[PDB]
Design a protein around this ligand. Structure first.
Ligand SMILES: Cc1cn([C@H]2C[C@H](O)[C@@H](COP(=O)(O)OP(=O)(O)O)O2)c(=O)[nH]c1=O
Ligand SMILES: Cc1cn([C@H]2C[C@H](O)[C@@H](COP(=O)(O)OP(=O)(O)O)O2)c(=O)[nH]c1=O
Lengths: 135, 134
């Protein structure tokens, strides 16, 4: 609704195609594009949040289960269609679970990588939130 | 000229990661990302060149065989690895073939989709270049 993104997909005799255009079908400017592949193992990914960064998650192949928490509510959504993007805003905790063996997960980011934008501790994250409420 | 870009790739028990950053590891600013999937049939694609667009192609899954003509040299390249990107500069002809079934192909473009920037006559492409040569 506010988080789930339905990208317009095109289909022909040849296949499918999806195009994402910076600040057209995504609320921000693209500066970085990262992706995860050749996954394996039972240990998740993510479990962190970001102060400034805005992102959009997309399961290009296979599937992945992702959790969300803006401190308030928690949401879960299983990405399994390249045509769907998930919006992860700043100040939103995230987790990437259950990567299918063939999963390819892509992320469109508003800025370059920067370890100091991270909130990797749940409590601080929570903390971070409350503080915020006050202001 | 080689047009291949090899991205640094992180590795751990979890899998692999590759990160592409506008103007950092790719000679241009990203304005659009598009990908092709659920491909079928025996028809290739591409077959055009762009006068202003700068792209980078990445085969995120499976594989695909690419042909790039810069007007000086033709290069055929099989992409079967997400950590390799091919740079398709302006006035560079390209074609995608041999898409595996599970093939997922991705393109990073320096600009929005503009049909008018597209040359779809190889011959014309060849001419445009010559002209360019002056
Ligand atoms: C997402 C991302 C990660 N990285 C680096 C940070 C780490 O050195 C590594 C893995 O990222 P991440 O999964 O966040 O690391 P960690 O194992 O601590 O959870 O990749 C970049 O360099 N650029 C990026 O865009
Ligand atoms: C690559 C791309 C395609 N499309 C559309 C154009 C077409 O209607 C469809 C796929 O077409 P395309 O791959 O460009 O080739 P062709 O015109 O020969 O069919 O997707 C966009 O809207 N934006 C893009 O960035």
């Amino acid at each position: 609704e506010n988080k789930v993104i339905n990208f317009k997909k095109i289909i022909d005799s040849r296949g499918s195609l999806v195009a994402i255009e910076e600040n057209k079908n995504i609320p921000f400017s693209i500066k970085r594009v990262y992706y995860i592949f050749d996954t394996k193992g039972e240990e998740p990914r993510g479990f962190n949040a970001n102060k400034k960064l805005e992102q959009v998650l997309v399961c290009l192949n296979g599937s992945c289960r992702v959790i969300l928490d803006d401190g308030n509510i928690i949401q879960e959504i299983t990405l399994d269609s390249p045509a769907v993007g998930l919006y992860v805003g700043p100040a939103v905790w995230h987790e990437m679970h259950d990567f299918s063996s063939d999963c390819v997960m892509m992320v469109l980011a508003s800025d370059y990588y920067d370890e100091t934008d991270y909130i990797r501790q749940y409590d601080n994250f929570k903390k971070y939130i409350a503080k915020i409420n006050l202001e």
